[PDB]
Design a protein around this ligand. Sequence first.
Ligand SMILES: CCCCCCCCCCCCCC(=O)SCCNC(=O)CCNC(=O)[C@H](O)C(C)(C)COP(=O)(O)OP(=O)(O)OC[C@H]1O[C@@H](n2cnc3c(N)ncnc32)[C@H](O)[C@@H]1OP(=O)(O)O
Ligand SMILES: CC(C)Cc1ccc2ncccc2c1NS(=O)(=O)c1ccc(CCCCC2CCN(C)CC2)cc1
Length: 411
Amino acid sequence: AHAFWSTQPVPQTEDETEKIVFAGPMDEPKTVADIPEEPYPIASTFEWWTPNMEAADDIHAIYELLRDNYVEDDDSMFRFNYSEEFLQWALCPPNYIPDWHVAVRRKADKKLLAFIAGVPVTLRMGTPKYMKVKAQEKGEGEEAAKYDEPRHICEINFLCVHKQLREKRLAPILIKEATRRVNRTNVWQAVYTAGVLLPTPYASGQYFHRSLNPEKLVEIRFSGIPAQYQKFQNPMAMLKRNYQLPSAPKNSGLREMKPSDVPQVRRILMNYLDSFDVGPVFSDAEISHYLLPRDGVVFTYVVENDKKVTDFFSFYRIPSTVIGNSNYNLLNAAYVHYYAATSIPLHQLILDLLIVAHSRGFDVCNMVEILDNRSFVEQLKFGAGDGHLRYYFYNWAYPKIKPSQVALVML
Ligand SMILES: CCCCCCCCCCCCCC(=O)SCCNC(=O)CCNC(=O)[C@H](O)C(C)(C)COP(=O)(O)OP(=O)(O)OC[C@H]1O[C@@H](n2cnc3c(N)ncnc32)[C@H](O)[C@@H]1OP(=O)(O)O
Ligand SMILES: CC(C)Cc1ccc2ncccc2c1NS(=O)(=O)c1ccc(CCCCC2CCN(C)CC2)cc1
């Protein structure tokens, strides 16, 4: 029973999605001229506001809203606390559209009540490999390949309704208004992810985490000894020994990424991502934006062997407010971003990610099982978390795929 999602151009059930064999649009074709010029109606007490996400004070306003009202874990222990610097980075990539950053404020006092954001991305989202094999068998190759060209679409993130205004049907209004503004830019698809199940994901993956500071983690999450360590005489010493890391990177030639690295990083990353059914395509400007180091935000290291970049990894920072535990304000988490390995095993490359993160004072490394992230889970002592990340498209029929066929990292 979905009063809003039943009206939208998405597959309505798992059963429906399991039937889809080719990529393509769901809705009637439309043009920009069909789409309302006026913002979607909202109660008189409210007003639409388009923040300027390159302006410090507007960034700070959105920052506070998310700090206090964004995504929590399921047990009221953590709330994401994306930083102001991070929001500017994530929301203002090359060729971003300011109008796609959508807020609602109370008109009387200008209190910020809600937000949703779209950003442009170029995405490969053609029929997946396994369904093209089927299509070929059935003599339907061209129909399966029709939508292979990378598509200039919208990624939606940062949907947030203030906690005081929950369960008032505000979220559907925010979605409708974002949709209208994106459609008015001649864009007709979106990709989005969520921790909740909605109609209807094309892929779903567990979260995995790797403790870097177990004494802090075990104290917050338990807030004493985890069950399987209860058998040791000295559980904390065992925990610390289990998660200990080198104090400096092992790969000779590791260094932070440089602007002159951009084109080589672009080539090795694109060659790698092209192996996945769903993944982004980045220009040099986008590689520069999403991967060059930005203090407190994104950290990227390359393996350089004789002036050649042969491998790289990146991670980004999202602290979470420790909303349950009294002893700590924040948990400093490093999330695995894009990477590519051509000279060393992936586990050896990502060991250095763990070492740098640890050395820079992060408490935990988190990721979803997209890309080849499962290839280093066991070797590097990641464990499954309680979350899942579900991947969705708006106005795009798409067959179920495995999370290891997804190459899009969402921030
Ligand atoms: C071509 C361009 C298209 C662009 C748009 C593409 C689509 C983008 C879609 C958005 C992608 C966002 C990606 C992210 O940012 S996912 C992160 C979402 N944010 C949070 O979880 C932060 C904390 N929670 C909140 O702020 C609120 O609980 C939210 C805002 C989530 C719901 O507010 P509230 O709790 O006050 O409820 P309501 O009474 O207003 O509305 C209830 C309706 O909302 C449906 N609902 C609940 N949660 C989500 C959810 N995460 N995505 C989509 N729909 C959701 C729900 O099923 C129901 O519909 P229906 O079951 O009756 O049908
Ligand atoms: C406590 C650690 C061992 C792992 C950890 C660290 C920080 C967290 N902060 C907030 C929520 C959960 C945290 C967590 N536990 S977890 O199992 O790794 C996990 C559980 C739940 C989620 C949230 C649902 C995903 C929200 C999506 C995330 C991506 N975005 C583009 C749209 C919103 C994320 C991560």
